[PDB]
Design a protein around this nucleic acid. Structure first.
Ligand SMILES: [Mg+2]
Ligand SMILES: [Mg+2]
Ligand SMILES: [Mg+2]
Ligand SMILES: [Mg+2]
Ligand SMILES: [Mg+2]
Length: 80
RNA sequence: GCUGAGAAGCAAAAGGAGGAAUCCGCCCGAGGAGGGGCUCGCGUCUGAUUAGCUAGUUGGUGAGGUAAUAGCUUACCAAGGCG
């Protein structure tokens, strides 16, 4: 579901999907996490999509998790 | 919106950020406040052993000019203006 999805940009390339999921699991249950990687170089593009089970947890995650520091890097948390 | 009794005629733009939401801008009107331009009453030194001064000068029309009123300009008419 697209309204239940949250785009996270400016993620450090050293950030594992486990830490992203841990910081964004505080706002609610996460149905899925997909990190976007370059097809050719296999390297992390620095952004990912997170599907939450509910839309209330999606909006509560968009509001308070913006500018949040993850591994020494401020990340941009918005809607997909 | 501007010209014009009207008929009509005439006039604008710019993108840059951000992954998107969005932000800072851009053009045309209509207001607000502030900042300037003008006009006028009043007040604003000494000399009479300084007494007459002024002719775009004082007013009128027509054309121009100014962001705007105005001899601001110019031509014509009148002979005023200050003491
Ligand atoms: Mg044109
Ligand atoms: Mg940039
Ligand atoms: Mg862009
Ligand atoms: Mg004094
Ligand atoms: Mg003359």
């Amino acid at each position: 579901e697209s309204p239940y999805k949250v785009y996270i940009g400016n993620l450090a390339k050293t950030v594992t999907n486990e830490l992203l999921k841990d910081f964004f699991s505080e706002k609610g249950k996460v149905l899925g996490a997909k990190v976007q990687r370059t097809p050719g170089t296999s390297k992390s593009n620095g952004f990912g999509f997170v599907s939450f089970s509910s839309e209330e947890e999606v909006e509560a995650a968009i509001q308070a998790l913006n500018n949040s520091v993850l591994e020494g890097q401020k990340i941009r948390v918005n809607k997909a």
